Write a protein that binds this ligand. Structure first.
Ligand SMILES: O=C(O)c1ccccc1O
Length: 357
């Protein structure tokens, strides 16, 4: 499967000492049929307890989704400052060129952030510009002549030289309570910000699973990217009835449990998905997920071209076939209509059912 990007294809970019930040492969290079998502790049940013990513800004519109833990983020713009703290499931939209720094304010729990970002300069070409740092990573402030910086900051080429250079530790370093308590107090708000993935009722739900989806049609933050952050919660031993998306290519990744998937291309692409593995579900392709293991099945994913995207189910009480009449069913499968109608209808459940034990 060219759609299957295992967790091992996440390329850790910078020398990150405490935790690390990993960029997944370009979707188009592995097999040039994933070119609708060629401008899109997915990443996974990982923060150990009491860590801290140096303030930077990416060229490209981003979307942070918190998968594990909690922490504090700070978005800095030319004439605007905002400090939010996030829990599990919180989605927040990062705009291009905006400066950002994170921190794991938890002393035992770890910080996992599932990240989406679309290019703006060259299709897929994504770069992080670090205003902080020293030698690791370089600070773009060291790409300017000393007399330029000396004339910009009004400072001799000594204090600036010792400032932007004297810094050894990587992107993610350790923070301390005297720093955190102040940082988290800037974040402490009263009475755009983040929104949890369960801010809504499940778009679809059964006694065996739930599906939450943040949509551009509701959340303004998502209208620019035309992206939807759906979250699919399958219960132990359960499954999603085979369905397909109308126009949205999804970039889905397992965050809890082991998922067994099958999908039509019609080549039958099958596989197993562990936590951290990425699967791409292009638009129109049917697919099903099954919880395989003692654990549950929680699995999150971004969706591009999200506006007006529906889900059409191919089985269950509410599938597309009820909206196809009897005679068309006869011509379709070359059997009596009341006979195939009694095949499609003897599943009383609609979206999530019991997977094969
Ligand atoms: O197929 C989807 O639309 C989807 C969206 C978000 C998470 C998991 C998913 O399968």
């Amino acid at each position: 499967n060219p759609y299957l990007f295992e967790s091992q294809r996440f390329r850790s970019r910078f020398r990150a000492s405490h935790g690390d930040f990993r960029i997944l492969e370009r979707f188009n290079q592995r097999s040039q049929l994933l070119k609708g998502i060629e401008k899109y790049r997915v990443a996974i940013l990982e923060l150990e307890p009491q860590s801290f990513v140096l303030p930077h800004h990416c060229d490209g519109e981003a979307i942070y989704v918190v998968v594990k833990g909690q922490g504090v983020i700070n978005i800095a713009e030319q004439d605007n400052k905002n400090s939010f703290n996030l829990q599990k499931g919180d989605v927040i939209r990062l705009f291009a060129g905006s400066n950002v720094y994170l921190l794991n304010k938890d002393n035992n729990e770890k910080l996992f952030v599932y990240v989406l970002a679309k290019s703006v300069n060259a299709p897929g070409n994504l770069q992080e510009y670090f205003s902080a740092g020293g030698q690791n990573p370089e600070s773009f402030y060291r790409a300017f002549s000393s007399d330029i910086l000396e004339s910009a900051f009004n400072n001799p080429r000594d204090k600036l030289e010792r400032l932007f250079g004297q810094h050894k530790e990587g992107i993610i370093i350790k923070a301390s309570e005297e720093q955190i308590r102040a940082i988290s107090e800037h974040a402490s708000r009263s009475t755009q910000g983040p929104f949890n993935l369960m801010k809504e009722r499940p778009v679809f739900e059964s006694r065996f699973g739930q599906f939450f989806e943040a949509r551009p049609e509701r959340y303004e933050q998502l209208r620019d990217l035309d992206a939807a952050v759906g979250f699919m919660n399958i219960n132990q031993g359960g499954m999603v009835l085979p369905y397909y998306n109308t126009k949205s290519t999804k970039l889905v990744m397992v965050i809890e449990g082991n998922a067994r998937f099958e999908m039509a291309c019609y080549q039958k692409i099958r596989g197993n998905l562990n936590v951290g593995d990425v699967l791409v579900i292009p638009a129109g392709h049917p697919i099903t997920f099954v919880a395989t293991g003692n654990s549950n099945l929680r699995i999150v994913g971004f969706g591009v071209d999200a506006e007006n995207n529906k889900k059409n189910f191919l089985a269950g009480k509410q599938n597309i076939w009820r909206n196809i009449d009897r005679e068309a069913k006869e011509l379709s499968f070359s059997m009596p209509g009341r006979e195939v109608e009694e095949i499609f209808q003897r599943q009383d459940q609609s979206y999530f059912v019991a997977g094969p034990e």
